[PDB]
Design a protein around this nucleic acid. Structure first.
Lengths: 297, 66, 297, 88
DNA sequence: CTTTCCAACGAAGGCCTCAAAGCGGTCCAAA
DNA sequence: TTTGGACCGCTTTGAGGCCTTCGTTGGAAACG
């Protein structure tokens, strides 16, 4: 059945094909079904990433039942309440299932969980009808609450959250991706963070570039319009490294990139995401949505 | 303020009470009551007036001393 | 007074109970018998209540509480960030200096909570609590200034001094009988390392290593640049650069963060990360006595 | 905006005090006059509760006077300091 | 020419976590 | 069989991370 062709497709999945070019996201206003207040609460906040196997027998109707079940589990673990909400307009395609939010309110929200999937169809192409595919989870709150919610979900839907990790290659690619994005209001200078590998804690280089200089350098190293290519990313990194070495005769290339921040969003290797501008928000998710699939497959 | 609205209502209520009542001793007692309460109400209105005046003056001398 | 009582209570709460006895030995405001009446093995609430009883039996004031706060600062001296002021352009006396400083700060607006405490190595420590023309000086936002007699340097903790910086500077320079007072751009948290920097007070023959000349040259250069002595414990650096690309000048801004700088930088060359001779922008941190840098071509 | 609850309770206390005082000097016709005055008080309470005011902050009636005195002293002190400053 | 507010954002007080150690219970060595 | 000793248990608690609040010039906007 689905298992056989799924075996074949992950057999074909080898590190031999060239990395495909990616289309630069364009300035896109928030969708009509998207509530500005809900995303405004979501944006300008820190989120922890989690990859998820597809939900088993998940229904969007019995949300109150889920809320009361989580409340019962929490009180069993022990003036708080659990609220389930349905959020429209942030699905990449019609194939991607509807997204929803879970909140913990102390009768002041303390813990928020977001389940979503944008442009994620390969998982949806290899799944049966019973399952719901929202492999992207964003957590914001206390770690104990996150662990409790994860335990409940493991017991209920037969799934786990895996802490999604981002390497230097992916982080550099996404850095180039958002520095390709056009921002009308440069409200945050781009900034990169590094960490020298050493058992005792050592120097952590932070390198910041003025947004105008960064955009000019990007357009200088921008060849294919509306698209980003591996050669563009490599030359971007090479130019930064050459500038750093010309300044200080220090090979930054022998250091691990750990955090990249720009005007629109910021990412960290451990799985920290900060979002500022809505105009590219959706596209952001799509990119990181691929990483969940790449962790599932 | 609130008092600037409740005093006219108090005046109209006192007027109607005086009109409806017929006893002369009760009329005199109500008149003395009205005089006392009106004096106190206008006194506290003035107190709030110099309250906001003193607040503005305090801000002005704060700017001056700065 | 209740204000001094709660101030002393807060300071005691800041003091770890493991060294409270030493505090008394350094405070000496209360008689030793009163100290003996209190055991330190009992609960924290009990010991603080007994200390409140002891200080209320005597006359609690602001000077003794300020002295206790000063000595707590001495024992910790790690919770604040320090900046360095330089005076320029020969007879000294403690009493008249204190009198002049007190008079100037009283003339500042009307009043200020000023306390003095002489320390070893001519380290006069001054606690200053600021207050406006219509309010008692606040004891929750204090500042500390360290003065060395007959010296061209002074240290200041800048937590809220940005409100009125020139006042403290002019008061200090008039009390020090010095004309010109300037602030060098040097900021750090390890106060003792600042003290040191400102005053300059600091086999299996079968293996055949190749390029050994490079290793012996790089280690020799690193040793000559740094030295066998333990480098001063510096924790933060930041360079603001604006130089031509040569590859409209690019404006760069770097921050080096490290629990122990000058050691990871010492190990960069042996690890091969940077060239054998490091750039002068990193080899003159103790030499130039500079922390914030601006360089142009 | 309706009347502030502190103002309502204060006014009710003053009406209670004045009704007690006006009942003290009344010897005869006690019950009818006290019933009429109670009806008057309740109708006034309803009218003041229903009354609407623009959203202007108005502090407690009894304390404001004291505040003024302190405020006055503050200004005096400020003025004194100002003079001293100018003198310097 | 002046005044007040939004912004840029810096900063430090406060919330929250846990790694540390003393006190307490329990098993086992010794009388 | 009884008593002391040392184990592991438990609670207490000290320190670091971190969010949020306070302060805020500096610019923008209204204006005696």
């Amino acid at each position: 059945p689905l298992q056989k062709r799924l075996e074949s497709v992950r057999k074909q999945s080898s590190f031999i094909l060239t990395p495909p070019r990616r289309k630069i996201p364009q300035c896109s206003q928030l969708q009509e079904d998207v509530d500005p207040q809900k995303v405004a609460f979501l944006l300008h906040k820190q989120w922890t990433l989690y990859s998820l196997t597809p939900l088993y027998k998940f229904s969007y109707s019995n949300l109150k039942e889920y809320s009361r079940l989580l409340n019962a589990f929490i009180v069993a673990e022990k003036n708080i309440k659990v609220i389930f909400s349905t959020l429209l307009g942030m699905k990449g395609t019609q194939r991607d299932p509807e997204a929803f939010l879970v909140q913990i309110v102390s009768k002041k929200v303390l813990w928020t969980g977001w389940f979503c999937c944008v442009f994620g169809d390969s998982l949806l192409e290899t799944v049966s009808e019973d399952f719901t595919c929202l492999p992207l989870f964003l957590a914001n709150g206390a770690e104990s609450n996150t662990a409790i919610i994860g335990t409940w979900f493991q017991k209920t839907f037969d799934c786990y959250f895996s802490p999604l990790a981002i390497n230097a290659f992916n982080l550099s690619w996404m850095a180039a991706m958002w520095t390709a994005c056009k921002m009308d209001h440069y409200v945050a200078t781009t900034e990169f963070l590094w960490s020298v590998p050493c058992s005792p804690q050592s120097l952590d280089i932070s390198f910041a570039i003025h947004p105008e200089d960064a955009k000019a350098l990007w357009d200088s190293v921008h060849k294919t319009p509306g698209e980003v290519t591996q050669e563009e990313v490599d030359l971007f990194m090479d130019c930064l490294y050459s500038h750093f070495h010309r300044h200080f005769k220090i090979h930054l290339s022998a250091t691990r990139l750990v955090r990249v921040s720009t005007s629109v969003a910021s990412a960290h290797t451990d799985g920290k995401i900060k979002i500022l501008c809505h105009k590219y928000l959706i596209g952001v998710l799509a990119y990181l949505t691929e990483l969940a699939i790449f962790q599932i497959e | 303020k609130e008092l600037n609205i409740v005093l006219p209502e108090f005046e109209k209520t006192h007027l109607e009470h005086q009109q409806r009542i017929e006893s002369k001793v009760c009329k005199a007692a109500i008149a003395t009551f009205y005089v006392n309460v009106k004096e106190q109400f206008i006194k506290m209105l003035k107190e709030s007036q110099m309250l906001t005046n003193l607040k503005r003056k305090n801000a002005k001398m704060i700017s001056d001393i700065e | 007074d209740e204000t001094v009582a709660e101030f002393i209570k807060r300071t005691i709460l800041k003091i770890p109970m493991n060294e409270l006895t030493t505090i008394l030995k350094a405070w000496d405001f209360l008689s030793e018998n009163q100290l003996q009446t209190v055991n330190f093995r009992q609960r924290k609430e009990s010991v603080v209540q007994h200390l409140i009883h002891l200080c209320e039996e005597k006359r609690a004031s602001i000077s003794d509480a300020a002295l206790l706060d000063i000595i707590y600062m001495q024992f910790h001296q790690h919770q604040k960030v320090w900046e360095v002021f330089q005076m320029s352009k020969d007879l000294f006396d403690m009493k008249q200096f204190k009198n002049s400083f007190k008079k100037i700060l009283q003339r500042a607006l009307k009043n200020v909570t000023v306390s003095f405490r002489e320390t070893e190595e001519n380290a006069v420590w001054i606690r200053i609590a600021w207050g406006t023309q219509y309010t008692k000086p606040n004891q929750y936002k204090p500042t500390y200034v360290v003065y060395y007699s007959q010296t061209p340097y002074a240290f200041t903790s800048s937590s809220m001094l940005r409100r009125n910086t020139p006042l403290l500077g002019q008061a200090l320079t008039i009390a020090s009988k010095h004309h010109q007072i300037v602030k060098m751009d040097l900021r750090s948290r390890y106060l003792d390392s600042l003290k040191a920097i400102v005053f300059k007070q600091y086999m299996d023959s079968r293996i055949i290593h190749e390029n050994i000349v490079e290793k012996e040259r790089v280690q020799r250069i690193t040793q000559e640049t740094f030295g066998d002595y333990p480098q001063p414990q510096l924790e933060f650096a930041q360079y603001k650069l604006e130089t031509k690309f040569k590859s409209e000048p690019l404006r760069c801004l770097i921050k080096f963060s490290s629990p122990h700088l000058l050691e990871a930088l010492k190990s960069l060359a042996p690890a091969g990360i940077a060239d054998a001779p490091l750039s002068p922008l990193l080899t003159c941190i103790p030499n130039k006595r500079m922390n914030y840098f601006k360089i142009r071509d | 905006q309706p009347l502030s609850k502190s103002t309502r309770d204060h006014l009710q206390t003053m009406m209670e005090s004045v009704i007690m005082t006006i009942l003290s000097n009344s010897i005869k016709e006690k019950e009818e006059i006290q019933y009429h005055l109670n009806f008057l008080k309740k109708r006034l309470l309803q009218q003041c509760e229903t009354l609407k005011v623009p959203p202007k902050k108005m502090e407690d009636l009894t304390n404001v006077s004291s505040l003024l005195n302190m405020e006055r002293a503050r200004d005096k002190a400020n003025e004194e300091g100002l003079a001293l400053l100018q003198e310097e």
